[PDB]
């Protein structure tokens, strides 16, 4: 419970000093981990807010630009929605290992083939060319924003796990060791007193025996 209960000996005092240096080193290494994670975590949070601020205005411009296509190209939306096969843009999952933890992120990739190339050839194609470009720009900010989200959530869990270990070291492991080391130093000194008293009483009996042995000469 409150102590490790290694039996009092100079060995155990050495082992408990070593365990204390071990636990204190572990605390310091994990404190550096927690600080580095905390810095990145707060950086990512600011990037999330900023990326959402960027996304809103681009999305409003794109959403209004569709009305210009709807003015000249008619209900082109039905042909677009009905005719689907393969994407022109896709993503790949990727990792960082900073501060000893895996953070998932995404990158944007482009596949060349425009599955809507001829849309509005007859009329409205000027507006539809602006329209595709506006949403095609928006997607890359979404892929980045999603990467910030997954990173932020993963960093939050990693900080909690790290701080649990740091505080378990600081409030469980180190206190068991320091209370044990106090018990070891105490009982080691109790054995030293019990030895001292025996050696002193022996020395007094010897002095009595010497004095008696000299008296026996009379």
């Amino acid at each position: 419970k409150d102590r490790i209960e290694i039996f009092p000996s100079r060995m155990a005092q050495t082992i408990m000093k070593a365990r204390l240096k071990g636990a204190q080193t572990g605390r310091n290494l994990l404190k550096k981990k927690s600080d580095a994670l905390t810095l990145r975590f707060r950086q990512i949070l600011k990037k999330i807010i900023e990326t959402k601020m960027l996304m809103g205005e681009v999305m409003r411009e794109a959403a209004f630009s569709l009305a210009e296509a709807k003015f000249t190209a008619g209900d082109f939306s039905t042909t677009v929605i009905q005719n689907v096969n393969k994407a022109q843009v896709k993503i790949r999952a990727k990792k960082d290992n900073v501060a000893g933890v895996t953070l998932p992120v995404f990158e944007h990739y482009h596949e060349g083939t425009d599955s809507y190339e001829l849309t509005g050839l007859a009329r409205g194609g000027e507006q539809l060319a602006k329209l595709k470009r506006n949403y095609a720009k928006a997607v890359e900010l979404l892929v980045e924003l999603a990467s910030l989200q997954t990173s932020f959530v993963t960093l939050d869990e990693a900080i909690k796990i790290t701080n649990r270990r740091v505080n378990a070291i600081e409030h469980v492991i180190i206190p068991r060791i320091e209370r044990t080391l106090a018990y070891i130093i105490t009982e080691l000194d109790e054995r030293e007193r019990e030895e001292f008293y025996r050696l002193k009483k022996i020395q007094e009996k010897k002095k009595i025996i010497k004095e008696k042995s000299e008296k026996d000469l009379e």
Binding site: N28, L29, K33, L199, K200
Partner: protein, 250 residues
């Protein structure tokens, strides 16, 4: 030099006489012949392990950890045969070398020595295993008196400023080296890489010396500056701007 040898298998009481004999000679050289003297004692632990025998010979009951309780006085009666004195040039300086039993500073031999002596210097098993010779660790070391050994007139005006900044950069360097091992090199700042490059060059040029290379204080400070020059002038925060203006240039 005057050299006294007491072998491990010489009489234990001659091991007790040997410091008292050496200091009696050092008092003659210093306080009567006006010499400056440096008295080196090579293992006080072997002296404590002798005083224990003479104590057991008188049938005295052992004190703490089996050594005689009065060791503080006997050890003081050795070590305090030191210092400069009124109206004389002579002065006994002393370096009692001391093998910490079980590597432990809490042991009574180092503990009493730390109470009597003005400071301590540590040999370190880590530096020794790294083959850094001499393996003196600067961080737990402290020359208690150093502020009156150094500066203008006594050595050079920069010395304390250099030593403080070197100590700080080695301490921060050790902390950043531990940080690199946790976070990886990509997470280090440019300033972290300076404290880490300083740390590598410091152990290889400042602490490392080899057994027969002799360095003056002056040459040591110029090596100190060759290392401190690694940093930007503004990063050397403990040094005064006058000392930087006189000595940061190389």
């Amino acid at each position: 030099v005057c050299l006294f040898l007491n072998l491990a298998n010489d009489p234990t009481i001659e091991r007790i006489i040997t410091p008292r004999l050496a200091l009696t000679t050092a008092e003659f050289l210093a306080y009567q012949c006006e010499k400056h003297v440096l008295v080196i004692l090579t293992d006080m632990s072997s002296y404590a392990e002798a005083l224990r025998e003479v104590s057991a010979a008188r049938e005295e009951v052992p004190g703490r950890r089996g050594f005689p309780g009065y060791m503080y006085t006997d050890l003081a009666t050795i070590y305090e045969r030191a210092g400069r004195v009124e109206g004389r040039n002579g002065s006994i300086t002393q370096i009692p070398i001391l093998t910490m039993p079980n590597d432990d500073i809490t042991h009574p031999i180092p503990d009493l020595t730390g109470y009597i002596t003005e400071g301590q210097i540590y040999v370190d098993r880590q530096l020794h295993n790294r083959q850094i010779y001499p393996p003196i660790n600067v961080l737990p070391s402290l020359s208690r008196l150093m502020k009156s050994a150094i500066g203008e007139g006594m050595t050079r005006k920069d010395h304390a400023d250099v030593s403080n900044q070197l100590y700080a950069c080695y301490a921060i360097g050790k902390d950043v080296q531990a940080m690199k091992a946790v976070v990886g090199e990509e997470a280090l700042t440019s300033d972290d890489l300076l404290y880490l490059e300083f740390l590598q060059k410091f152990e290889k040029n400042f602490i490392t010396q080899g057994p027969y290379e002799n360095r003056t204080v002056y040459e040591t400070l110029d090596i100190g500056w060759q290392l401190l020059r690694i940093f930007p002038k503004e990063m050397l925060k403990r040094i005064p701007q006058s000392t930087l203006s006189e000595f940061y240039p190389r």
